[PDB]
Amino acid sequence: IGKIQDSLSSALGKLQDVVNHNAQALNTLVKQLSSKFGAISSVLN
Amino acid sequence: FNFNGLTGTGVLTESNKKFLPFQQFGRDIADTTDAVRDPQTLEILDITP
Numbered sequence: 869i870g871k872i873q874d875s876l877s878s879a880l881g882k883l884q885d886v887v888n889h890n891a892q893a894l895n896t897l898v899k900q901l902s903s904k905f906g907a908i909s910s911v912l913n
Numbered sequence: 914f915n916f917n918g919l920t921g922t923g924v925l926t927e928s929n930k931k932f933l934p935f936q937q938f939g940r941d942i943a944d945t946t947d948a949v950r951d952p953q954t955l956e957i958l959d960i961t962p
């Protein structure tokens with residue numbers, strides 16, 4: 869039990885992955901609010 | 914609000930960031946305006962939704 873504590877204190881990639889994927893998708897969603905898709909601008913004003 | 918071209922909506926608040934003395938407004942990651950500089954008094958103000 870004393871070695872678990874060292875090996876961690878010094879591995880949680882499966883938890884870090886989930887977080888990264890969700891953030892990478894939420895950023896791609898917002899970065900699409902600045903494309904024209906074939907219009908004169910990206911702003912309704 | 915309209916700051917010499919920047920058109921937007923939101924609450925304006927006194928800031929504590931420091932632009933460089935040629936930068937007008939600040940942007941976030943994902944590219945949304947979140948700070949401005951008032952042209953007349955030259956102070957930085959945050960823009961919250």
Ligand SMILES: *[C@@H]1O[C@H](CO)[C@@H](O[C@@H]2O[C@H](CO)[C@@H](O)[C@H](O)[C@H]2NC(C)=O)[C@H](O)[C@H]1NC(C)=O
Nearest residue numbers: 917934935936937950951952953954955956957
């Ligand atoms: C724009 O004009 C206003 C006045 O019309 C300037 O305001 C002055 O600011 C100084 C601060 O350095 C004060 O001492 C003066 O009393 C202010 N004048 C008035 C009438 O309030 C303002 O500074 C100008 N913009 C810039 C960037 O200088």
